[PDB]
């Protein structure tokens, strides 16, 4: 396989389905990328967490993230900046670990180097997150810095031969909710040139209507022939609507967070399995789900395990939620390929929000 | 298969290996019986817990424990009395649930009925636990009551046709550490007649030397041609020494308790995987273990998962510990069948206690 090749196999409206080929494997798009410490074609590693425990140099000494996690397929790492204080400047950010008080710095160059030590296949440029809401001036200043940092990230990546030849680099569009800033950001990223383009700054609590409004104008600004990654999104209905707006890749902690907190995703909406209404419910978590949990165990049993404090309950919930997300993506890919995605999205919303 | 048939295939000293055939399956002995909410031939259900959540009538409405847990092989239930206050008498015990304040009673008859509603295959007689240490008078009084309750348990079981025809009933020897009381108890149980005989009252904090001393004289008092079940034991070295003294069946919360608290069992002794010495250790939890965890992941990765708070870490630890216990029992059975159990026990102890 090539280092990186994105091909679009079919389209419906703004939605696309296709493949990213990389040395370690093929990624089917639209893709959901689960956290690896939770089938999927690619998993996400949390650079901020890994640089603090066990440390990037230690991960490299252990053979890199692929060996460490037992995962030989592609891995995407974030830059570490979002989760990341002792000092902030045009150079980068300095911060102190709560785990042990150790001092750490992150910059475009250091973030790229940490991601190199982790051995990831898709590397994210290091940027400055923009809070929500943001004034036009603050959003512009933050976006402008992020574009300077995108060039620094590009140069650092290109200087590391093993990384340049075997990994890929994505740039991140910023600009808050402002169309003109989103355009300036897209133009700057395309001038630098990246293997894929993320839409940043939209997992900030703005609400789905506003997120969709910004995606409506922002995704068309990115190169059509490269993947589009919506970072930190989201709920099943967020994913469906974002695909309708041209997004190809997603990540979110929701499936694993929900699975540890009693919430299961189903085609009839989320359910809180701890509720007493499930104590005698012999149906599986979801009646169509093909996952191993739903083939074997009832809502009543999973309810019991969680209420009893048994670790097995949260594990089965998490397994189901991860599988549900992958089945959602498979249905999205098949429906786009078959020219029935618009109908799928309509049928999906009607059932998901009925909450039956 | 028959309702119940125990056959001894081979012996070495006081140790035995063989099979219990029941309608739902064959149990290879010596057997370790894990809790089912945690391969094994039989799992243990906790009657006290199940009668409080979700309730025995509710379990029966859901189809019984086999259907509820997705386990079609034999299940052994305890009587509920050990974990079980509003009143205590020759009739039984009354107690109030902390979960919701509901009132509950347990007696020989009610315990047998609850175990019937749960649908278990091996039913334990309801007895009175003897604290440790106990005076001779108190141990005798408690043992005498337990024998009266054993007869009541026998009669209640025999009155329920579905239970009498399809399940088995074990009696429990009591008597604390006193040889004469252990003998009186064994005589009373054999006169009543049971399908198997447990050695009760030895998971009480007395220490291994004392436990082995009591087993030395107590196990020979039970019928040789029936299974011998040591309740609530134990650590790997406890199991090996108890097999050397004629025990056929075991249960203990240690593998699952340890797996949720950072402790892994290995042939070189227990290890606390959270310790910093494992942060860079690329070996599996145990170098001989055939379990799925040890085929794939390192001590370093499991250390990381647990230190990071990831549920996956405790799940992998528990999976490894359950599998380790089953591999221990398999090695015990094979060595007895091959006439090399004495050597196995010696080699096991030398390595386990070296702690290398
Ligand atoms: Zn499922
Ligand atoms: Zn193992």
UniProtKB/Swiss-Prot annotation, chains A, B:
InterPro entries on file: ArchSynthase1/Queuine_TRR, TGT, TGT-like_sf, tRNA_ribo_trans-like
Subunit structure: Homodimer. Within each dimer, one monomer is responsible for RNA recognition and catalysis, while the other monomer binds to the replacement base PreQ1.
Reaction equation(s) it catalyzes: 7-aminomethyl-7-carbaguanine + guanosine(34) in tRNA = 7-aminomethyl-7-carbaguanosine(34) in tRNA + guanine
Binding, substrate: 78-82, 127, 174, 201
SUPFAM superfamilies: tRNA-guanine transglycosylase (SSF51713)
Pfam families assigned to the protein according to its UniProt record, in alphabetical order: TGT
GO cellular component, one term: cytosol
Keyword Transmembrane applies: no
Designated name of the protein: Queuine tRNA-ribosyltransferase
Family note: Belongs to the queuine tRNA-ribosyltransferase family.
GO terms, molecular function: metal ion binding; tRNA-guanosine(34) queuine transglycosylase activity
UniProtKB keywords: Glycosyltransferase, Metal-binding, Queuosine biosynthesis, Transferase, tRNA processing, Zinc
Function: Catalyzes the base-exchange of a guanine (G) residue with the queuine precursor 7-aminomethyl-7-deazaguanine (PreQ1) at position 34 (anticodon wobble position) in tRNAs with GU(N) anticodons (tRNA-Asp, -Asn, -His and -Tyr). Catalysis occurs through a double-displacement mechanism. The nucleophile active site attacks the C1' of nucleotide 34 to detach the guanine base from the RNA, forming a covalent enzyme-RNA intermediate. The proton acceptor active site deprotonates the incoming PreQ1, allowing a nucleophilic attack on the C1' of the ribose to form the product.
PANTHER family hit by this protein: QUEUINE TRNA-RIBOSYLTRANSFERASE
Region (RNA binding): 232-238, 256-260
Binding site for Zn(2+): 289, 291, 294, 320
Cofactor(s) the record lists: Zn(2+)
Active site per UniProt: 78 (proton acceptor), 251 (nucleophile)
Organism: Zymomonas mobilis subsp. mobilis (strain ATCC 31821 / ZM4 / CP4)
EC number(s) from the headed UniProt entry: 2.4.2.29
GO biological process: queuosine biosynthetic process; tRNA wobble guanine modification; tRNA-guanine transglycosylation
Highest classification ranks of the organism: Bacteria, Pseudomonadati, Pseudomonadota, Alphaproteobacteria, Sphingomonadales
Superkingdom per UniProt: Bacteria
Free-text cofactor note: Binds 1 zinc ion per subunit.
Annotated metabolic or biological route of this protein: tRNA modification; tRNA-queuosine biosynthesis
